[PDB]
Amino acid sequence: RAVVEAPVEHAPIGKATLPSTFEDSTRQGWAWDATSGVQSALTIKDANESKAISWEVKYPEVKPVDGWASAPRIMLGNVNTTRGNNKYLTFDFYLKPTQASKGSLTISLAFAPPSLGFWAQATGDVNIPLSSLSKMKKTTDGLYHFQVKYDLDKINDGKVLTANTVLRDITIVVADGNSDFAGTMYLDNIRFE
Numbered sequence: 584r585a586v587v588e589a590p591v592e593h594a595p596i597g598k599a600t601l602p603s604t605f606e607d608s609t610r611q612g613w614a615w616d617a618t619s620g621v622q623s624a625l626t627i628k629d630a631n632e633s634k635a636i637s638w639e640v641k642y643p644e645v646k647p648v649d650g651w652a653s654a655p656r657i658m659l660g661n662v663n664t665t666r667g668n669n670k671y672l673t674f675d676f677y678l679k680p681t682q683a684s685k686g687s688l689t690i691s692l693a694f695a696p697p698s699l700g701f702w703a704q705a706t707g708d709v710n711i712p713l714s715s716l717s718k719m720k721k722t723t724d725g726l727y728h729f730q731v732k733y734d735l736d737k738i739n740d741g742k743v744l745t746a747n748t749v750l751r752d753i754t755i756v757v758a759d760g761n762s763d764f765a766g767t768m769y770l771d772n773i774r775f776e
């Protein structure tokens with residue numbers, strides 16, 4: 584299936600680049616998956632004094648049965664990278680809510696390794712409760728700054744990412760955990776470490 588809307592003015596696509604820093608004012612190869620429930624503009628905005636890819640999302644009040652249906656699902660296609668000697672994949676993730684009071688966001692990471700059926704999903708989904716935010720200190724530009732980490736030795740389905748396993752795509756999903764989130768999201772510094 585494909586989720587479609589009228590042409591949207593994304594920032595230039597650029598070329599797949601890791602670490603993804605967005606400092607060339609392009610998306611450095613990131614784009615929505617054709618199945619992403621969010622297809623609005625991906626632009627390069629400043630977040631916490633660095634350029635970051637960004638989009639807007641307000642999840643539906645009526646929650647879909649399928650937990651990824653309404654989710655931003657962003658992908659770095661055809662990067663053909665490998666983890667090397669890195670234990671983690673990590674990135675800066677920022678929120679600028681106009682509404683956030685209940686439920687949570689559940690952030691998942693996956694890859695598409697041609698040797699592993701084109702899908703390998705990190706086990707360690709990260710949940711951000713929206714009631715936690717009001718007590719969290721914001722950045723000077725009014726964002727909530729998370730550095731999210733995924734242990735690449737914890738993968739579903741007994742699949743193993745070796746140092747040399749080719750990862751053709753990287754996918755990040757920000758799913759709605761029964762939340763009332765509305766606002767802006769940003770990613771920066773997407774890298775293995």
Ligand SMILES: OC[C@H]1O[C@@H](O[C@H]2[C@H](O)[C@@H](O)[C@H](O)O[C@@H]2CO)[C@H](O)[C@@H](O)[C@@H]1O
Nearest residue numbers: 618649650651652691693701702704739
């Ligand atoms: O439908 C949500 C569900 O998706 C699962 O991943 C799928 C993905 O949606 C599809 O694009 C891809 O081709 O295959 C994978 C694996 O079947 C995901 O594993 C679930 O955690 C998620 O709830």
Ligand SMILES: [Ca+2]
Nearest residue numbers: 604633634771
């Ligand atoms: Ca940056």
